[PDB]
Amino acid sequence: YQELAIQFAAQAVDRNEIEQWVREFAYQGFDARRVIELLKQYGGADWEKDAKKMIVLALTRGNKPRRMMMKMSKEGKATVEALINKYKLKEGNPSRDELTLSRVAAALAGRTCQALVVLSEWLPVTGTTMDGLSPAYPRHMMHPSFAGMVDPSLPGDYLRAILDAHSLYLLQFSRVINPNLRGRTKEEVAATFTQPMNAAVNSNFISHEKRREFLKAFGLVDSNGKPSAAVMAAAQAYKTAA
Amino acid sequence: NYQELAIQFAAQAVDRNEIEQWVREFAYQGFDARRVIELLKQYGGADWEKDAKKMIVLALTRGNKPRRMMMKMSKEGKATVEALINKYKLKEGNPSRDELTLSRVAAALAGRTCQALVVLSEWLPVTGTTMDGLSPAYPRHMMHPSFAGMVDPSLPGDYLRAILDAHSLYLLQFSRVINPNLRGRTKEEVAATFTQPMNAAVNSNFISHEKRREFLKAFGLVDSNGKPSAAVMAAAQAYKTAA
Amino acid sequence: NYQELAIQFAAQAVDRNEIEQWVREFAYQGFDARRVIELLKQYGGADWEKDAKKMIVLALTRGNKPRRMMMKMSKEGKATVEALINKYKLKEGNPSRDELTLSRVAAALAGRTCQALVVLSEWLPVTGTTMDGLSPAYPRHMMHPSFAGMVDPSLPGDYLRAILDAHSLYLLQFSRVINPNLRGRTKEEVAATFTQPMNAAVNSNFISHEKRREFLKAFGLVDSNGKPSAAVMAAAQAYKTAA
Amino acid sequence: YQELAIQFAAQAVDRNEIEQWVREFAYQGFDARRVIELLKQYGGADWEKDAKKMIVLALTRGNKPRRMMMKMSKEGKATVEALINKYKLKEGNPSRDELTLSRVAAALAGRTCQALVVLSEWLPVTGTTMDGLSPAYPRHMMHPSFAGMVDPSLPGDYLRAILDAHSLYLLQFSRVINPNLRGRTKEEVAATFTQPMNAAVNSNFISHEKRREFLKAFGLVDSNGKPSAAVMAAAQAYKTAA
Amino acid sequence: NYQELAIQFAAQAVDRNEIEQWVREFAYQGFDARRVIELLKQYGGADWEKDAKKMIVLALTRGNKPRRMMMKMSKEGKATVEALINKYKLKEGNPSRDELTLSRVAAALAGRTCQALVVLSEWLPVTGTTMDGLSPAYPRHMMHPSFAGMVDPSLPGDYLRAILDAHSLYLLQFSRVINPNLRGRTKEEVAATFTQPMNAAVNSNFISHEKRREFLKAFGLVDSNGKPSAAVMAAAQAYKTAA
Amino acid sequence: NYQELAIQFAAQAVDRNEIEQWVREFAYQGFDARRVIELLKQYGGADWEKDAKKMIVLALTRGNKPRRMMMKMSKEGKATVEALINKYKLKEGNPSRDELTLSRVAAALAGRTCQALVVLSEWLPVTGTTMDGLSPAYPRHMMHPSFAGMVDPSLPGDYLRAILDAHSLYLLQFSRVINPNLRGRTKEEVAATFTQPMNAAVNSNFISHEKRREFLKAFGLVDSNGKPSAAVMAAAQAYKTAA
DNA sequence: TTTTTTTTTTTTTT
DNA sequence: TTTTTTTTTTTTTT
Incomplete structure (x- = not known):
């Protein structure tokens, strides 16, 4: 009876059926496409130059923009404050439609x-x-x-x-x-x-x-x-x- | 008195098959595969096999915590997992003999x-x-x-x-x-x-x-x-x- | 000259038999094997030997915690262990001396x-x-x-x-x-x-x-x-x- | 002035003066003499044979007499209970005028x-x-x-x-x-x-x-x-x- | 054929000067040395140089916690450290940028x-x-x-x-x-x-x-x-x- | 501007004796021996030396906790320690510059x-x-x-x-x-x-x-x-x- | 980052 | 004795 798990095993595996399911149940975390879509949306024509600045900022100062701002030069603090307000930057791991210095560096x-x-x-x-x-x-x-x-x-x-x-x-x-x-x-x-x-x-x-x-x-x-x-x-x- | 009873009890030949039946019967059991299949058939009906295939992919690539995996998943996936949780009354971890988990489904099959x-x-x-x-x-x-x-x-x-x-x-x-x-x-x-x-x-x-x-x-x-x-x-x- | 022979006598001359009687009389006795066999016969009756064999297999391969082992065991096994717990009033660990444990059964036999x-x-x-x-x-x-x-x-x-x-x-x-x-x-x-x-x-x-x-x-x-x-x-x- | 600690150091040390002080301030813990005095007092003529029993009891079973009594033979439990009541035995580290199996073994x-x-x-x-x-x-x-x-x-x-x-x-x-x-x-x-x-x-x-x-x-x-x-x-x- | 030259250009051609300006502009600046010297001159007046020398010895041999070090020091030293804390409004750790610490004094000089x-x-x-x-x-x-x-x-x-x-x-x-x-x-x-x-x-x-x-x-x-x-x-x- | 001031400040020769006086003055200090002797003389009067000798034996063989050592001590000793605690206002551990401990007495002498x-x-x-x-x-x-x-x-x-x-x-x-x-x-x-x-x-x-x-x-x-x-x-x- | 005399004899398959 | 996607960039003499 219940050892019919043999009949269940006997069915040949379908590569496309399983690939549809792995695709449907996939871990949905970091969306690089959404990050670029958001940079273009907030930055406009300046999005590339600001993204380069944010890459330098992430790589050498971290992912906490309001924190790094406090131990920085007058010019730098002014640039970081402008970037925080234009790109609505966050710290840590916020929602999928939210930008962080980490996510910018990762998508690009x-x-x-x-x-x-x-x-x-x-x-x-x-x-x-x-x-x-x-x-x-x-x-x-x-x-x-x-x-x-x-x-x-x-x-x-x-x-x-x-x-x-x-x-x-x-x-x-x-x-x-x-x-x-x-x-x-x-x-x-x-x-x-x-x-x-x-x-x-x-x-x-x-x-x-x-x-x-x-x-x-x-x-x-x-x-x-x-x-x-x-x-x-x-x-x-x-x-x-x- | 009780020393003589201990000798006469030890004097009886070791029953290899009686002991081998008992060691099997009392052996550690992580899950009852038969009960798992019985429960899948009961909740799923004729769709139990297709849903079991889905749950195998779900366990193998996402784990044993169905409500947790649901949080980092697509709209479609989220709907499939929620439907499976409610049809098969899925639990996380190691619950009772009469409870199903993604792990147990993958293990029984x-x-x-x-x-x-x-x-x-x-x-x-x-x-x-x-x-x-x-x-x-x-x-x-x-x-x-x-x-x-x-x-x-x-x-x-x-x-x-x-x-x-x-x-x-x-x-x-x-x-x-x-x-x-x-x-x-x-x-x-x-x-x-x-x-x-x-x-x-x-x-x-x-x-x-x-x-x-x-x-x-x-x-x-x-x-x-x-x-x-x-x-x-x-x-x-x-x-x-x-x- | 007498104090010399006194330290010599109080150091070398030991009443080996008096001390050996005492160490045996005061020795740790969590249970008396004779009492364990008396209790098995009392609770089990004619089935005490077959149940004792089962409890030996259970003690040797699963341990001394009968209610714990019961949870990760087959349907048949769990039912046998529950029956043994209730017939022989089995306990875990080190209870009183008129109390039976899987360990004490294995030890007396x-x-x-x-x-x-x-x-x-x-x-x-x-x-x-x-x-x-x-x-x-x-x-x-x-x-x-x-x-x-x-x-x-x-x-x-x-x-x-x-x-x-x-x-x-x-x-x-x-x-x-x-x-x-x-x-x-x-x-x-x-x-x-x-x-x-x-x-x-x-x-x-x-x-x-x-x-x-x-x-x-x-x-x-x-x-x-x-x-x-x-x-x-x-x-x-x-x-x-x-x- | 205050570097007169030289005059204080200059005074030759007195072996007997210092030995009186070390004697007066000494750690007063285990008194083997008091233990023997108490054994003789409670045990009378049987104090030596009971002390030998208590030495075996301490060395092979420990210092907790009421605890050891519970995992012992009928005869042994009866002997330990009699010793507890005759010598007013305790567990652990009680007052100076109190007997324990440890103190008996240590004094003898x-x-x-x-x-x-x-x-x-x-x-x-x-x-x-x-x-x-x-x-x-x-x-x-x-x-x-x-x-x-x-x-x-x-x-x-x-x-x-x-x-x-x-x-x-x-x-x-x-x-x-x-x-x-x-x-x-x-x-x-x-x-x-x-x-x-x-x-x-x-x-x-x-x-x-x-x-x-x-x-x-x-x-x-x-x-x-x-x-x-x-x-x-x-x-x-x-x-x-x- | 253009996508090839595009991945080649986006990988090998880096604006070394643009990036170097930015890394310098965003660099960690707990304090500005020019501001530290401006503050020493402001609080200390004509004695700022001699007090700065004292604070360098104090920073190098005792650390950055002035109130803490004060407790395991001579009568004369404690009185000098207390005077310096109050004249230069000294702090411990990493305070705001218009704030002086023994470390910042040693670092600016x-x-x-x-x-x-x-x-x-x-x-x-x-x-x-x-x-x-x-x-x-x-x-x-x-x-x-x-x-x-x-x-x-x-x-x-x-x-x-x-x-x-x-x-x-x-x-x-x-x-x-x-x-x-x-x-x-x-x-x-x-x-x-x-x-x-x-x-x-x-x-x-x-x-x-x-x-x-x-x-x-x-x-x-x-x-x-x-x-x-x-x-x-x-x-x-x-x-x-x-x- | 402030760069020129930093060079001219560094241009001044290092005063070895000024720095050596400062490093001494700011050095770690576990206790002020002079204050300890000042306090012994103040509380003890003419008996300060004999009581200090007693406290040296007391510190060396019993430690720095006077009320604690008092518990495993003779009647006579207990009375001497209690008298010393009350005359010299003895404390345990590391108290203020103006407090005496058995350790500090032994250390100053x-x-x-x-x-x-x-x-x-x-x-x-x-x-x-x-x-x-x-x-x-x-x-x-x-x-x-x-x-x-x-x-x-x-x-x-x-x-x-x-x-x-x-x-x-x-x-x-x-x-x-x-x-x-x-x-x-x-x-x-x-x-x-x-x-x-x-x-x-x-x-x-x-x-x-x-x-x-x-x-x-x-x-x-x-x-x-x-x-x-x-x-x-x-x-x-x-x-x-x-x- | 301090400061002077141990603790005290049977477990039990994760 | 369990069960599937890290965390996120400046300290400071015990």
Whole structure:
């Protein structure tokens, strides 16, 4: 009777039926498309220049705009106050239709990752610090929003190399900005940062082709997707990392 | 007096089959698969199978807290989950023998659940890609706790151990990701929390030994005589040196 | 010159028999085995032996908390445990002396408990396989604290020490598994929790020296003259170098 | 002016003046003389036999007489109840004029330490367990009341040998019976047990001559106070102990 | 073919000067050195320089909590600290920007602070002797976070990196001593707390590149062309292998 | 503008003596010895010296909690302590600059305190015998925190370090015994709590360098030129390898 | 960031 | 003895 669970198992699996359901029940959190829609809406023609300012502001000062405003120059405070009021900026994790410095940096990952080369020594974990862990550490990987640039169709060994090279940074960064991860083990830090990382790697924002074009442009992969010597070095550094 | 009674009681031959029936009957039981199927049929009627398939995808990719997952979901999804909560009177955690949870549905219907893992691989808390980094071509059919429900316990001990150590490589990763209070603990400490539910499913009376080995053969996990595949052997070893 | 012979007499001359009578009279007695068997016969009647066998399997593979174990068990098992709780008025932990617990049943009937361990080996908190990893072909009859009640204290000291060190290898593992705080403590700290109950049963008045040695002989633990087996000798050494 | 603390320092120290003061301000805790006075008072002619019973009772069952009574034989419970009522026994640490099983064992250290040879395998830390740490561990040292048998006039190296040999046991025992010391470091256990140990070693109860006569009788020292091979072995085992 | 050149342009072509203006404009500014000196002159009058010297000694050897330090100090000292608190309206921690703290005084007057370190060396939380154990003849002028304000950012990159790594060896020690939770954390975790304030002062508009290099030359940290000294080179290497 | 003022302020030569006066004046101060003596003389009158001797024995062998020690003391002792509490208005712990404690009395009169240690050696929390086990013939005059008050800081650095490392061997033991919350901490962690009060007493203005070296010479701790004794040298080394 | 004499003998399958 | 998407960037001599 009840061991008819065999008949239920016997039915061949439908890739499209299951893919409709996984799509319907999917975690709906960060919408990069909505963020860009809101920036364009509040900023108008100035949205790009203000977004670049907000990327610098997020990467070097954090996600609390009213707090950072208090320990800043006269000119800076005036710019941040204008941005808070134009873009109706918030702190932390508000509703889906609300903008934060984090969300701006995350939706515009292509622009954020390019800025890291210049901003490297102004970050919580500097390029110099990373170079101590792995020589000539890839600066374009030094932000959680880099996960949105990873082509998931890349050969598994090449893909794992990029993510292990990026995880070397995440391990340092997470232990430093997440109060719950201060001094915790590698395995613990990776268990808290892999699920949001892998969601960004397998998101529908930016096609595989565009993602690999960015990795090629940043000099992270070659013509066939083979990671650079620096990525390979970093990927190994993560395997023996503490 | 009572010493003579203790000797005469011990003088009686050990009944291997009587004790083996009892150890089975009193064994740990995480859920009654038969009661779960009985409840799905009762609440769902003729739609119970299609709704069970939905709940398998829902459990595997979103978890066991239906009202919580509903908060970070689309309008359509939110409506499907709300309808399922109300039809099947779904609960979170470990409720009574007469209550349904997304976990229990996936666990009672292990044969289908394990088959879905091939498609759902990159949407799981621990992806197939991640597992391949630990052990090459990691068996996707093993990437769910309900896989223990498909293991034939009559398999030769060495073959049986290799299947379970392979599966344990996944369990070790999965437990650290889905359970935050197991993240800083050792391999031995994490294994201590997942071996009892695993071994219960392996030694349960739900789905016979013959049918269970037929599944392992079909999933390509064992050969004609029950010898595990190279991938299973590789993962069992990866688990022995795992941290 | 008299004070010298006085400190000499008060230090060297000890009334070994007077002290040995007292230590036995004051020894921890959570229960009297004779009273336990008297209570089983009283509540169970003609079925007391079959129910006692069930309670031994239940105590060895599930523990001493009958209402707790009942919740993660099959429909049939739960119904058997509930029936046993109500017939024998079973309790958890350490109640009064006219009270029965699964532990006390297994302890009073040590002769059958120890015989069941051969069949139940892979269902115990510490399996026979796990023990074999510490000492080859570990004696299964020693894999329960109630084994101490089977030990003949009149055995030659060296033979008696081999039996107890061999049994202590198991106790060391068992205590760490059934008491998680002990996992990070020393052999000496873990030993401190199990040596007093062990030595009390070894020197108890329940079952004579002659019968106790006839059990050790029957279990194949000692020879005709009380010389321990190769497996016992191996286990006794494994304990000396154990951590 | 105020640097006249030099004139205060300049006064030569008086050994007898200081010894009167240390005597007057001394810690007044356990009075072995009062304990024996109370045993004789309540027990009469039976005080010695009842004291021997109470030593066995303390060493193998503890210091809680009403508690131990509940998990004991009919005969034993009857004896313990009679002892509780004759000697007005208490649990824990009551007033100076109150008897406890601990205080009885401690005041009659000579009798207690002799009983350890027979009681060895009934103790929280057995002789067998100790033999695993140091071969043929001295059974007479396996009780805190042994500190009352130590001659403090012994040559420093011989004296330290006896106390290091005894401390090997105290380390095991303290970690086991003191809930606050469960799994703590050697240095921590020794910091909590050295002050009460050293007080018993330097107490006025039992003269130096009698103390050394006991150590000689127990076979712990030779004619000149040189410790035995077992004590020497144990003293070393404590130096490398964890 | 245009989308290719578009991803190429949006990845490689970065407006280095636009971004560098912004990072400087938004940089953490707990205080403006010019405002600190303006406030010292305003409250202190003609005595502002002598009182500032006192506050530098007070900040370097006692900390940033003036009312706290006052309690474990001599009669004369306590009276001096109380007078300074009331004249300069001193605060603890990180107050508003028109507020003075011992730290802000030492930071705005980096040129004298760093010069005082030669005399104050054995009175600091991390002594010169301690530093000499990590790197021989460690540069005493680098033994304060305010040293970063003395660093010329126009220096050749390799020379600039030697100065900062040499200074970071001190910062690593100092942070562990003045923040006890950091003692059990990694170089990278400890570095994360001191690199942002360091790099902000290195790239601040207070004191020109030309003057900053004239300080490094005067302190004997660099030569005529900006090449660091043997001690700086030694300290830069000690930091690379530091734990 | 303010940049030019910062350069001209730094252009002024470093006044070594002005800074050295200030670092002394602002240095940590556990107690004012002068105020303690002033208070003893005020409350005690002509009996202040004899009562101070009593309080030194009381602090050294019983501690700093006078009402607490009174509970485990003789009738006579109890009366002496109660009389001293009421005459000198004695307090426990670390009260105001104008309050007396047994510790402060012993600390302000270090010359006498250190001389008493020879007689009181076997009555201290850490005995002379215990210390001799760590380092042969350990200097008894060093067996009190107030010994730091006798150290000449003008001594050659290597000689000065050997005296303090020797003394630190005792401090390490003493702190673990008198302070229960320092028992599980490392050498570095315990040293972190006792170096600041030690170094304050070493660099205090109470009792000149000349008088302090005269004491070290008298106690046999240094020779004619300040070279420490073999016992001091031995203890300094014992501290380097201490746990 | 301090300040001087341990505590006190049977558990029980997460 | 459990059950699926981190948190969010300046401290300050015990």
